[model samples]
Target: TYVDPHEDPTQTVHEFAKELDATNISIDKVVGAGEFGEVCSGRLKLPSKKEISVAIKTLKVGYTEKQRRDFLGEASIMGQFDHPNIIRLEGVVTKSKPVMIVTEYMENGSLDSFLRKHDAQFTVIQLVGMLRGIASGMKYLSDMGYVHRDLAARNILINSNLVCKVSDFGPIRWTSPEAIAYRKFTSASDVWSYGIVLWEVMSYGERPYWEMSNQDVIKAVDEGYRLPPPMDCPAALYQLMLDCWQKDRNNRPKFEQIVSILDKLIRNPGSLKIITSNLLLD
Candidate 1:
């Protein structure tokens, strides 16, 4: 997807973004900081004069053409996605200074902070349910042929209902050194990252590799150092992570299999408590 730099404003992404006006959109207090700029809680006045809450992710002023394109590129992808377990992109503000990306605000914020704040609060089944939601979201994106360069607990957002949406998820972008070393991307690489996400959920929002550096991870992975099961992680679930980290991309389970396994676990909670090591990766 090589988009021409000068032609962005006329591109469908920017054209759609240019339509949002200040008269209809009002900014509120800051909610968080984003990659390009500050994220603010705001109100969007609809065509019917109905106002609703939204998260306004702003791109800082004085951005280069490439910055604007990359910023809006996220919104462009988000706009086309429609899944309960995925974040929704309401619209974008491109014509205005400090361009904004509007989306439904998750009151509980990201899954990482939420889980860290309430350490050990959720039951195993409850935690598994959250992972299931994320897998479902990933399955949707994989089916769409979109590889999330950054997938991890930090990227997932949570609602009051404890539902976790793979908020704007990752690489093997949450990925392997080989991906960059090889100058390529593939579903297998994405599967590698998905394994990391599984580890994050099983452990309450802990950093992958126990705070290891990027180089450390690469070295460890090259040596076949897979993360051991999270403390108290069900054997069945830990087995899935191993499957995702498989050396053979073709051997990695599809998102459909991931979702089905999680669903089955949800249906049979007992399976989670018992240890099962003899099974091979499907």
Candidate 2:
């Protein structure tokens, strides 16, 4: 019962991804759990005899044709991206059962959990470097006219080298008011989510709006309430975050501007000083 992806005209997965041979992949062990099933750190040996480490998400058995299509749909989307900070798609295995979506392995895993594990261990510059990587990646996506429906630290993967990459993409608290109300998602809405991500990075993975219920978060956001700066957060960074959280989406800075701001901070480390906690009161 082979479903030849090349023969299936209904899905464009084949058009986006190269059909990887199932036998060429070897699942080493489970690294994490994904929506599809167990995600494994594995090795993929290509026909050219090149072997590379990869993260594999397997499609569990008992899935209907629709489920299979939906699972591969993500691979199709990922296949279109090519950026140092965007997760790379190696290929897809669908000619055989237990289909898979394979990508380069990230040793550190998602950004939020990674930052949590190494709490306060990194310098502010290091954290800003990670943020810059994410911003550049996002700028690329935005330039390509792709709106990331979900943009959060939890959805960003980090490697041992501390390079963060945009990955599987939402949550209510991270959502913008307009997105939550009208379901109108655009790059502007992503800017709102980026503000939450900025706070999360500076706070070293602290929960946004700690202990605030989703309903209360929505209400507070509607009332023009923005999150306060984390302890020791740079004043300039806090200002950038506030600009991102502008109530009017049009007032939000584009990803290009965000990257430029971070680049300036990186070059001028002295500017990161001067944290004013009272800025939150304004």
Candidate 3:
């Protein structure tokens, strides 16, 4: 069973700083902000005078003891991951009031922003490449006994070379060690999210719930409503998305299965053409 590291709520930020021995890092500019934290582009000056560019994400105030443990747990998991598609964690700043997570910065920003700015659907090949990158990252997490509870386009970052890297480990959870089973995310959940991500990429970052409320989305999902096929999306891809949004979580395909399907699609782009016949529109 997986045992979570114990944390002391009464421990001050400075105490954590002493524990980690972090030094010479300062927040330079705010690059992004989300519900739990804000990412700031910053630099850490090493003893050798070399400066390293890093993104510092500071959690919001009022986190409970469990929340703090989760934050540190996420950082610990991220630190263990090393792959082309996974964002690298340089280090963390725990001594600060709001715990800061430091990671490599992606200049191009999130996949959602990238698609919106391009105003064009990715080619089948490009889409496949993006999915491959994300799957590769997820595979690593899976192997490490972790599941990214929140896997979405907004959480995937694209670099200048068009390489897709998975980010935002804050929502990740452990999935093994029966004794430590605490509703940790499962691989199935990530696969389900991946299906939604495919829709986002295929539709050029169309908002998931433009005018629909959270309740509406949940109801629609329960009733098997999903994004209609994109004009250019191949049918095989649409089918994959449908399978992903199944009401029963176990019904979702595994990442390995998804990777195989995507690999086949990459080899034969024409396969997507099969989707045109059914013509399902929302």
Candidate 3 per-residue lDDT, tens place, 1-282, comes to 222333542332233222323567777898677656676887877667888877777777887766666666656656656788899877666666777777787778899889898876456788778878888787777766766777888889998778999987652211111212355357777776787788888877876655565555554554546667766777888888878766566777877788788888888877766754121333
Q: What TM-score does prediction 2 earn?
A: 0.92
Using all chains and alpha carbons, the TM-scores for the candidates as numbered come to: 0.86, 0.92, 0.74
Q: Any idea what lDDT model 2 has?
A: 0.85
lDDT of 1 by residue, 150-221 (tens): 778888888878888877621232585457568556766777788888888877887777666667666667
Please give, for residues 1-282, the per-residue lDDT of candidate 2 as tens digits.
112233454366777788898888898888676776677888999889999889988887798777787789877777777889999999998888788889989999889988888889999999999999999989988887778878989999998899999987315868888999999898999888888999999988887887777887888788878888888888999999989999899999999999999999999999997775222432
Most TM-score-accurate candidate: 2
RMSD of each: 4.0, 4.2, 5.9
lDDT, candidate 3, at 268 = 82
Residue 247 local lDDT, model 3: 55
Candidate with the greatest lDDT versus the true structure: 2
The 0-to-1 C-alpha lDDT of every candidate, in the order given, reads: 0.76, 0.85, 0.69
Q: Clash number for every model? A: 11, 0, 2
Q: Who is ahead in TM-score, 2 or 3?
A: 2
Return model 2's CA RMSD, one decimal. 4.2
C-alpha-based local distance difference test score of model 1: 0.76
